[PDB]
Write a protein that binds this ligand. Structure first.
Ligand SMILES: O=C(O[C@H]1Cc2c(O)cc(O)cc2O[C@@H]1c1ccc(O)c(O)c1)c1cc(O)c(O)c(O)c1
Ligand SMILES: O=C(O[C@H]1Cc2c(O)cc(O)cc2O[C@@H]1c1ccc(O)c(O)c1)c1cc(O)c(O)c(O)c1
Ligand SMILES: O=C(O[C@H]1Cc2c(O)cc(O)cc2O[C@@H]1c1ccc(O)c(O)c1)c1cc(O)c(O)c(O)c1
Lengths: 496, 496, 496
């Protein structure tokens, strides 16, 4: 746990130095000096800092009747894209310099995965356990309100999302508040927030989103030996053990869908304990260990283990909990060989230099948990379209398929003069399930893969153009910076 | 060696403790517990901190073509009144904790003089000498824009003002920006800022406003020996020497109008040096020492003097420059007798306990320069009325008087049989000039006096109610607190 | 008789038939038919029904956690004047037809005193004693919301007021909600409801409003002998007695001011008993029977009397309590000479043809107690002008008078050799306290006073045109109608 603050500011500067030659060479203009350096040196000094960042403070009535002040923050990084976006967090750790960095990170995350959004982030310095459910509703509903009055919430202005100990039911309050007060007259009022439950205009598949993101991100890597020929290991994805931190939302489903494919587990940790089992624990059982009683503490197969969470002899480690759990106190340790950032910045630049020198591949959060916002993107789009995806183009498409297949049948039955034998009316077993169980989530799942997979091409191409090889982090930010630049370059200085 | 931030936080807490008794006493309800404290002890915890405060960051291009980032801040303290009020500052000293304190100060300043405004403040971390006029316009107009976006400028939401290094021309750009872009459709668009020049919707007597405020504030004190029977010093207002710091806007007319009434000067200081002359210098001459040359440096009868500005042998000192120039390094000094705070918070709580223990009169900024916003109030009101004051009720007044006077004539020539003798048609010499040189200016001066004078009564009543005597500072805040509390107590916790 | 339902429908229709001739006569257009009647006969049928009325149904939840559906209504009668006006009511009495009726009343009521307000009224079908204060805030707060989303609360659209069991604190919740959700961007947000407390932007004189309205309505008839040469009685206002009913708010001030000026009392009684004393009870002592005890029961000189309240021998009877206290069961007696309707229509058309046929004067509530909304009208304007009336023109007008008084003195001290002898500097003792105690009240009471005086001069003129002599009721509505008609006529049929 370092002070740092400038955690993300280092990576930008790192990626910034290398594109200083590309932008001056790719820009086609009539200025042609070396003040080209001076324009670009200026353009990057604008993207670095957050353009707006509102500090807040509002009172509420506890169930006592006692009165308490609540500090809250929200930072819009860039506004190159019309709507900023980023989750909101409820924890005592909440700091001003926190969201100022996190919102910055969200800008480049949206750039990597070609999501037309600006980076944003918020935070409330409370502790959610210490308040009731009735107490916590008034915090969110009024936090909503005090943000709409100053233009930090609304479709096309800013769209927040859930995060640390923030769930669907809370976003539902956000929506219900905005659609009943300020954004009343707005048709797309319910689009003010992504992550709301499905009866509230949500989308199928974001419950899983960060998980499949964790999954699809790892998938596009241990299926290409171009990075195993250096790291070692086996393209045989199966027999690989993993360990998660922070069993919650991102922690569950990064495991719920990682197990499915034959990849065993070995450990699970929360904010008090850990688990150790070389046989491989199964979320089949231990998932009814949440509110069934309360807090994890071991179970059948689940042994009580303490020391830390990383430590354990493993392959794939995912610190999907709080922030900066990896520093020099533990970077030369970690009996692992590939790390994947499920949470936002658990790896510090203090540790990358060590990992890089030990041939350990850390999957950057800037890429990995980008599925969450990519689907968030879709959820937003859903509310602007006011239709479940495929709600009109399923029967037309499944009827078009069934006519197409039979068309090859009958076309095969006149070259074959008896009409009755051939039968291609039946599609393959996988495809028959595709049009019988056709829903909205299938569109989302395929779009998530098409966005995720094509983004890994944008990295593993820009990494092999600069010999980064294993440092995909400095290969990620160097692609996002280039995408946000042209957005500023081709927009021109605005004289207002 | 000044001190840190909490500047005003101590004064509120200082005044807050003594109202804790009468608030539970004057409150008339069926609540009736000792929880009366818990409501009130809670209500005060809401008023202390600023409710909103936007940190800004916007880019501009110098006349170079070079690009520079400009950090900008703005704090709305309270929102108990529908609009917030507070000037904006242009200086490298600009800090977040600065305006946060200053905006707090403005809330109570507007409460002392019964001005239905909420406190606010802003600042721009630049240095105006280092930019051109063409360069500085871009800052203001852009800064305007980024504030209307997030709702920190607009009539009935937040109205800024000029301050130090900010003049009428800049307020004119503010207005011209707001009235051509965001608030175009607003009828009262030009009401978004007070302090603008007269051809742009200002008000006569505002150029002088802070000055007359300094004057009438001092006037209501050396006109009653109930504070000279303890301080010493003659009620004969004339033969009193004064010295000003910061020959700029507030420094000028706090002297220009103070000299008028027969009060000798002795010293004037700026950011370079000072002046020392026991005969008394005259603004009639050394006022053409601004842009005529550029900076002060002595003149005929103006000698070069250094050392300091405050220690000079004087009676009335007015630190009308930056902030906190009176601390432990100079409080047990100052060869003065009565000090008057022309700028915002030049006396620290570190210096009051030294001044009070030596029987020295410090006139609180919370009250002194309140004329500045009191006229600001009027200028705002002018734009919602869209008439210069008296623009219709002058000839009706001047004609009604002349009919009234001849009515006493014609009624006195009836009891006196000759019809031609008596002549009360003519008013006193002073009243003849009144209805001849009648303008908007006069309605402002009389309303400023009426507001100012009645405020001193609300203080000197609540001062000897608690045996404060010489510490009118704590008699000021103790009066403003109870005015804002009433606004909060009778508005109720808003479930939103 | 329409004892509850079409309560006023008789009054309109009865008044409607009368104006038929004048309107076609007063009509100056190029029509010139017998179809001129068709125009007016239709236009009146436009005014008779409330053109809009919303029936509501919104839920809450009590301190228990249980849930209750709340019915509510609000009726916007006319929209000829841009904002609509009328209080809200919190009783089980509340009925669709009830508010649909009282809204009609408020239209013509605010057309007699010449107030540019359209008529409206609202109600909520509950009983406040059954709900806690906390429970009553959320009812009030959300009732506001559901009226704004549908356009029934807002300056220039519709402005409510207090009334039956509706206090200032409740009006304070209406504003705080409207001004914090829908009408946030509105400068006149808090101008959406009148009757709110002082600190929240109220006006001085609401509490004392209807009492003065009663008195000035009285004053404009015992001072005109046109209506004493037919009723009898001495115009000599002095030695006359009055009997009140409903010793509260309207009752107190209607007596306190009526006595102060010369009238003697005789009787007082509320929902318990009555007092009898032809010596004349004095309100300056018996008013400490309020919450100092709990209810009336008589006191020294205050006899314990039964029977009723009205039949007491007296001259001036005022029913300042509930609805309908005068029918065929008491009209053939009540040996009084004049009845002023302190409440809303305590006199039935089942009793006017007894009072009219007995040469008694019943003063319409259409004009008398209309002194509450006219002051409530001023409070609206205060919230619009954001200034206490005369905040600026108090020291200016006080300074103007002394200069006048000295102008005559100095004018008289020159035709007389010595300079200082004469002393008209001091004005009359009644005038000295006027400029000494000059406050908002004095302006409201006058603006009130001139309003009904002109109004009375407008009724008594329209009555002497149709020989109504004693039917002020039908002489009252007959006036408001032509005003409402003239608005509609010169506007035309809106083709939308
Ligand atoms: O609308 C689109 O415009 C983006 C296209 C684009 C790109 O392909 C490459 C690149 O290097 C920059 C770049 O700029 C835009 C952009 C997008 C997202 C951001 O966050 C951001 O700052 C800027 C878009 C989106 C897709 O997904 C597509 O497949 C597609 O063809 C177009
Ligand atoms: O509309 C008026 O309401 C203010 C009257 C008032 C008062 O006289 C004393 C007090 O202790 C509290 C208080 O509350 C209101 C207020 C005003 C200004 C603020 O900043 C603020 O927070 C609250 C007003 C304004 C005048 O100038 C008057 O002369 C006048 O009679 C009434
Ligand atoms: O702007 C004003 O127009 C009103 C003046 C007026 C009138 O004097 C007599 C009449 O028969 C009709 C009439 O039409 C208007 C009106 C006003 C109020 C209503 O409710 C209503 O339906 C219609 C006004 C208001 C005043 O208070 C004045 O003193 C004044 O000179 C002018």
């Amino acid at each position: 746990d370092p002070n740092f603050f400038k955690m993300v500011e280092g990576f930008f500067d790192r990626g910034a130095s290398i594109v200083e030659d590309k932008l001056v060479e790719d820009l086609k203009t009539r200025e042609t000096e070396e003040q080209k350096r001076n324009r670009v040196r200026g353009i990057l000094r604008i993207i670095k800092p957050c353009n707006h960042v509102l500090s807040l403070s509002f009172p509420i009535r506890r169930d006592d009747g006692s009165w308490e002040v609540i500090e809250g923050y929200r930072a819009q990084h860039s506004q190159h894209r019309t709507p900023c976006k980023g989750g909101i967090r409820y924890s005592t750790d909440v700091s001003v310099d926190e969201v100022k960095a996190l919102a910055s990170l969200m800008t480049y995350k949206c750039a990597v995965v070609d999501v037309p959004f600006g980076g944003a982030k918020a935070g409330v310095k409370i502790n959610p356990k210490n308040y009731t459910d009735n107490e916590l509703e008034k915090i969110t509903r009024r936090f909503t309100m005090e943000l709409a009055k100053k233009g930090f919430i609304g479709p096309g202005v800013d769209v927040p999302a859930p995060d640390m100990s923030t769930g669907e039911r809370e976003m539902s309050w956000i929506a219900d508040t905005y659609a009943s007060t300020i954004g009343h007259y707005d048709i797309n009022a319910h689009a003010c927030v992504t992550g709301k439950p499905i009866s509230q205009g949500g989308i199928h598949g974001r419950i899983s989103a960060t998980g499949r993101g964790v999954f699809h991100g790892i998938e596009n890597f241990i299926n290409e030996a171009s990075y195993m020929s250096i790291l070692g290991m086996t393209p045989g994805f199966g027999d690989k053990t993993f360990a998660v931190q922070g069993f919650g939302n991102v922690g569950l489903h990064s495991m719920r869908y990682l197990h499915r494919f034959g990849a065993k587990c070995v450990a699970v940790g929360e904010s008090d304990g850990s688990i150790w089992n070389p046989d491989g624990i199964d979320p089949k059982e231990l998932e009814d260990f949440k509110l069934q009683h309360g807090t994890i503490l071991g179970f059948p197969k689940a042994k009580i283990y303490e020391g830390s969470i990383l430590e354990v002899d493993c392959d794939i480690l995912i610190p999907a909990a709080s922030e900066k759990q990896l520093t020099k106190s533990n970077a030369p340790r970690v009996k692992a060989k590939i790390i994947a950032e499920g949470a936002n910045g658990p790896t510090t630049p203090e540790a990358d230099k060590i990992f890089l020198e030990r041939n350990i591949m850390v999957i950057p959060d800037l890429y990995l948990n980008a599925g969450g916002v990519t689907v968030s993107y879709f959820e937003w789009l859903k509310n602007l379209n006011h239709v479940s995806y495929g709600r009109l183009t399923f029967k037309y498409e499944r009827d078009s398929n069934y006519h197409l297949l039979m068309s090859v049948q009958e076309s095969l039955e006149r070259k074959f003069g008896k009409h009755g034998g051939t039968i291609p009316i039946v599609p393959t077993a996988e495809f028959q399930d595709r049009i019988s169980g056709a829903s909205e989530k299938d569109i989302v799942h395929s779009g998530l893969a098409y966005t995720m997979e094509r983004s890994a091409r944008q990295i593993m191409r820009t990494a092999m153009k600069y010999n980064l090889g294993l440092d995909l982090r400095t290969a990620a930010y160097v692609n996002a910076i280039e995408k946000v630049f042209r957005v500023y370059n081709e927009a021109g200085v605005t004289f207002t």
